[PDB]
Design an enzyme around this catalytic site. Sequence first.
Site, PDB file in Angstrom:
ATOM      1  NE  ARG A 126      -4.635   6.408   4.648  1.00  0.00           N
ATOM      2  CZ  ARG A 126      -4.019   6.835   3.547  1.00  0.00           C
ATOM      3  NH1 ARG A 126      -4.577   7.748   2.768  1.00  0.00           N
ATOM      4  NH2 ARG A 126      -2.815   6.366   3.239  1.00  0.00           N
TER       5      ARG A 126
ATOM      6  CG  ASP B 241      -0.442  -6.099 -10.123  1.00  0.00           C
ATOM      7  OD1 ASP B 241      -1.350  -6.683 -10.746  1.00  0.00           O
ATOM      8  OD2 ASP B 241      -0.246  -4.868 -10.172  1.00  0.00           O
TER       9      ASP B 241
ATOM     10  CD  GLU C 183      -7.937   8.898   2.599  1.00  0.00           C
ATOM     11  OE1 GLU C 183      -7.608   7.704   2.503  1.00  0.00           O
ATOM     12  OE2 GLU C 183      -7.916   9.501   3.667  1.00  0.00           O
TER      13      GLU C 183
ATOM     14  CB  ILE D  87       3.977   7.086  -5.592  1.00  0.00           C
ATOM     15  CG1 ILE D  87       3.194   7.108  -4.263  1.00  0.00           C
ATOM     16  CG2 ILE D  87       4.442   8.467  -5.983  1.00  0.00           C
ATOM     17  CD1 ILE D  87       4.003   7.472  -3.034  1.00  0.00           C
TER      18      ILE D  87
HETATM   19  C1  LIG Z   1      -1.398  12.459   0.262  1.00  0.00           C
HETATM   20  C2  LIG Z   1      -1.303  13.939  -0.157  1.00  0.00           C
HETATM   21  C3  LIG Z   1      -1.606  14.827   1.043  1.00  0.00           C
HETATM   22  C4  LIG Z   1      -0.340  14.936   1.846  1.00  0.00           C
HETATM   23  S1  LIG Z   1       0.874  16.010   1.466  1.00  0.00           S
HETATM   24  C5  LIG Z   1       1.866  15.608   2.764  1.00  0.00           C
HETATM   25  C6  LIG Z   1       3.152  16.176   3.006  1.00  0.00           C
HETATM   26  C7  LIG Z   1       3.707  17.012   2.029  1.00  0.00           C
HETATM   27  C8  LIG Z   1       4.971  17.581   2.196  1.00  0.00           C
HETATM   28  C9  LIG Z   1       5.708  17.293   3.351  1.00  0.00           C
HETATM   29  O1  LIG Z   1       6.994  17.797   3.616  1.00  0.00           O
HETATM   30  C10 LIG Z   1       7.452  18.896   2.807  1.00  0.00           C
HETATM   31  C11 LIG Z   1       5.163  16.452   4.319  1.00  0.00           C
HETATM   32  O2  LIG Z   1       5.943  16.195   5.452  1.00  0.00           O
HETATM   33  C12 LIG Z   1       6.168  17.295   6.350  1.00  0.00           C
HETATM   34  C13 LIG Z   1       6.755  16.669   7.584  1.00  0.00           C
HETATM   35  F1  LIG Z   1       6.860  15.392   7.296  1.00  0.00           F
HETATM   36  C14 LIG Z   1       3.892  15.884   4.159  1.00  0.00           C
HETATM   37  N1  LIG Z   1       1.271  14.626   3.464  1.00  0.00           N
HETATM   38  C15 LIG Z   1       0.052  14.278   2.982  1.00  0.00           C
HETATM   39  C16 LIG Z   1      -0.800  13.184   3.615  1.00  0.00           C
HETATM   40  C17 LIG Z   1       0.042  11.910   3.786  1.00  0.00           C
HETATM   41  S2  LIG Z   1      -1.451  13.737   5.159  1.00  0.00           S
HETATM   42  C18 LIG Z   1      -3.002  12.976   5.167  1.00  0.00           C
HETATM   43  N2  LIG Z   1      -3.748  13.241   6.236  1.00  0.00           N
HETATM   44  C19 LIG Z   1      -4.964  12.706   6.360  1.00  0.00           C
HETATM   45  N3  LIG Z   1      -5.700  12.959   7.470  1.00  0.00           N
HETATM   46  C20 LIG Z   1      -5.449  11.904   5.364  1.00  0.00           C
HETATM   47  C21 LIG Z   1      -4.635  11.658   4.261  1.00  0.00           C
HETATM   48  N4  LIG Z   1      -5.124  10.861   3.281  1.00  0.00           N
HETATM   49  N5  LIG Z   1      -3.423  12.199   4.175  1.00  0.00           N
HETATM   50  O1  LIG Z   2      -2.610  -4.457  -7.141  1.00  0.00           O
HETATM   51  C1  LIG Z   2      -2.389  -3.288  -7.533  1.00  0.00           C
HETATM   52  C2  LIG Z   2      -2.670  -2.195  -6.722  1.00  0.00           C
HETATM   53  C3  LIG Z   2      -2.408  -0.906  -7.190  1.00  0.00           C
HETATM   54  N1  LIG Z   2      -1.872  -0.721  -8.412  1.00  0.00           N
HETATM   55  C4  LIG Z   2      -1.598   0.635  -8.897  1.00  0.00           C
HETATM   56  O2  LIG Z   2      -0.864   1.372  -7.889  1.00  0.00           O
HETATM   57  C5  LIG Z   2      -1.314   2.734  -7.890  1.00  0.00           C
HETATM   58  C6  LIG Z   2      -1.708   3.138  -6.470  1.00  0.00           C
HETATM   59  O3  LIG Z   2      -2.754   2.331  -5.914  1.00  0.00           O
HETATM   60  P1  LIG Z   2      -4.046   3.047  -5.254  1.00  0.00           P
HETATM   61  O4  LIG Z   2      -4.419   4.183  -6.163  1.00  0.00           O
HETATM   62  O5  LIG Z   2      -5.074   1.998  -4.892  1.00  0.00           O
HETATM   63  O6  LIG Z   2      -3.390   3.613  -3.891  1.00  0.00           O
HETATM   64  P2  LIG Z   2      -4.051   4.013  -2.442  1.00  0.00           P
HETATM   65  O7  LIG Z   2      -5.494   4.132  -2.707  1.00  0.00           O
HETATM   66  O8  LIG Z   2      -3.590   2.982  -1.455  1.00  0.00           O
HETATM   67  O9  LIG Z   2      -3.407   5.352  -2.170  1.00  0.00           O
HETATM   68  C7  LIG Z   2      -2.457   2.861  -8.898  1.00  0.00           C
HETATM   69  O10 LIG Z   2      -2.046   3.463 -10.134  1.00  0.00           O
HETATM   70  C8  LIG Z   2      -2.881   1.431  -9.147  1.00  0.00           C
HETATM   71  O11 LIG Z   2      -3.439   1.310 -10.454  1.00  0.00           O
HETATM   72  C9  LIG Z   2      -1.582  -1.860  -9.221  1.00  0.00           C
HETATM   73  O12 LIG Z   2      -1.085  -1.750 -10.373  1.00  0.00           O
HETATM   74  N2  LIG Z   2      -1.854  -3.093  -8.750  1.00  0.00           N
END
Ligand SMILES: CCCc1sc(-c2ccc(OC)c(OCCF)c2)nc1[C@@H](C)Sc1nc(N)cc(N)n1
Ligand SMILES: O=c1ccn([C@@H]2O[C@H](COP(=O)(O)OP(=O)(O)O)[C@@H](O)[C@H]2O)c(=O)[nH]1
Lengths: 227, 231
Positions: free
Chosen positions: A99, A208, A34, A156
């Site tokens: 993704r 896990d 990603e 997270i």
């Molecule tokens: C994962 C870190 C990037 C972020 S930050 C974000 C977000 C941050 C703050 C927000 O509210 C203050 C938010 O919600 C606004 C309305 F919900 C989304 N969504 C996201 C993604 C879930 S959007 C995304 N779009 C993609 N095309 C791909 C991808 N991996 N993530």
């Molecule tokens: O079986 C698992 C899968 C994930 N993780 C932990 O959960 C966090 C988030 O997983 P990942 O980074 O794969 O998330 P994604 O890629 O789905 O965003 C990481 O710190 C991983 O090390 C874990 O301890 N066991």
Amino acid sequence: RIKKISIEGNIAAGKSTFVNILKQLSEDWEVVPEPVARWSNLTMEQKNGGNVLQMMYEKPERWSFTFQTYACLSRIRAQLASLNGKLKDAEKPVLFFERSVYSDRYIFASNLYESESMNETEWTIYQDWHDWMNNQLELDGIIYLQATPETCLHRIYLRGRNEEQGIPLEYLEKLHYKHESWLLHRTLKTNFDYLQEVPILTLDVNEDFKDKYESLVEKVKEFLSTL
Amino acid sequence: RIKKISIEGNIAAGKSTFVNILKQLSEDWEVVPEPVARWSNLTMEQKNGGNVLQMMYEKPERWSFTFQTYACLSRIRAQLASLNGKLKDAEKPVLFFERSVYSDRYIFASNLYESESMNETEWTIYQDWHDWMNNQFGQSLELDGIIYLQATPETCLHRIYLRGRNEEQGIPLEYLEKLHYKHESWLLHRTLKTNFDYLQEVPILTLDVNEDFKDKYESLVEKVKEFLSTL
Ligand SMILES: CCCc1sc(-c2ccc(OC)c(OCCF)c2)nc1[C@@H](C)Sc1nc(N)cc(N)n1
Ligand SMILES: O=c1ccn([C@@H]2O[C@H](COP(=O)(O)OP(=O)(O)O)[C@@H](O)[C@H]2O)c(=O)[nH]1
Ligand SMILES: CCCc1sc(-c2ccc(OC)c(OCCF)c2)nc1[C@@H](C)Sc1nc(N)cc(N)n1
Ligand SMILES: O=c1ccn([C@@H]2O[C@H](COP(=O)(O)OP(=O)(O)O)[C@@H](O)[C@H]2O)c(=O)[nH]1
């Protein structure tokens, strides 16, 4: 010739844990990670990716179109390059996308339009943008790493980006239902017809699997055999 | 086989008019009007354009990135549609582009940036996307030539009122002088260091259109025709 399989799921659901384990089991498997995950860190794309993400956190309604558009380009760029410059002389070729461009639009962009973070014109411009580029990376199947919001929330923390400690269960929760419909329930309407017929595989990743990933891998090879 | 020639100018140069005049003088001669002009008049592209064009006017530092990306994306698609569905079996087909991907970037988007209607990150994104929409999709669009219709910024403002579109009625002056400047910086001195290698090799017919030419254009067309034979 090369198989193209998208690994799909919620934030922190284990997509990256899965793809790091898959890359290593076969000479003939590679993963395209990603790009949004790399921006959570640096060259043109990395800084740009750096800033846009942070701006998104402060003000999604201002930055969603820009970030959805640049995310998708970065992903399309990054996938195309793997096709045309990797799995070069391997025998049983498979590429694992973390993704897809269907995720970009039909989970992520969609959700922002539903949260009024994109206005109608931005949503419709994004779809026209997305529709036109596409029919010019097309998938052989999809693997769904299915996890609850609670699991993802903890995870997270486990990795510990601060902006996601922020990310709330209600956000996870709506991202969570958008996956069920396209993938599990099979009833989200989409502009790319073959994805109503695209073979899908679903894996529970609540447990896990970090040290117990053979049952999952077995289903993956199984899955690939029918394609 | 189809030669591509961009008509570049500042706003109210008379481009639409002139491409339209050329177009009637030969069956080997087709045109692609600029997507934006069309919006400044319907389709889902118009519906979107009118909306974003209207917002662009209303708050330009919110909508410049959005506008620019859509206007360029939309140009490419028109130039493709034309360069597929026009002029097969022409002995000497010519496709005249009303503006180009290069005025989208090095003139309008660059200006919006420099005038602070896009931050660095937007302008860096735009530029990244630009190279890439063009590389991936816009290869069949390299220009054999450019016709620069050069008028003074003042001629241009004089011309803005006659066309008299309600939305355009409040366009400032010092804008034009900045655009001309980039239009001159771009198409006369060639100080502008394009990232597109081949733009340094493409020749430029520079035409002075400060004199009205709508019923008296024969020498303008003659210059095109000799330029065209030189391509
Ligand atoms: C994962 C870190 C990037 C972020 S930050 C974000 C977000 C941050 C703050 C927000 O509210 C203050 C938010 O919600 C606004 C309305 F919900 C989304 N969504 C996201 C993604 C879930 S959007 C995304 N779009 C993609 N095309 C791909 C991808 N991996 N993530
Ligand atoms: O079986 C698992 C899968 C994930 N993780 C932990 O959960 C966090 C988030 O997983 P990942 O980074 O794969 O998330 P994604 O890629 O789905 O965003 C990481 O710190 C991983 O090390 C874990 O301890 N066991
Ligand atoms: C004239 C209709 C299109 C518009 S609207 C517009 C504009 C209007 C008001 C503005 O400030 C209130 C404005 O901000 C200028 C800041 F430098 C731009 N510029 C423009 C163009 C000069 S931007 C443009 N980019 C293109 N790629 C193509 C095209 N025809 N126009
Ligand atoms: O030699 C000319 C050039 C332009 N115009 C007028 O000036 C305005 C600018 O025209 P156009 O839309 O063709 O300019 P563009 O913006 O397309 O460069 C229009 O009302 C034209 O009718 C004119 O009367 N004589």
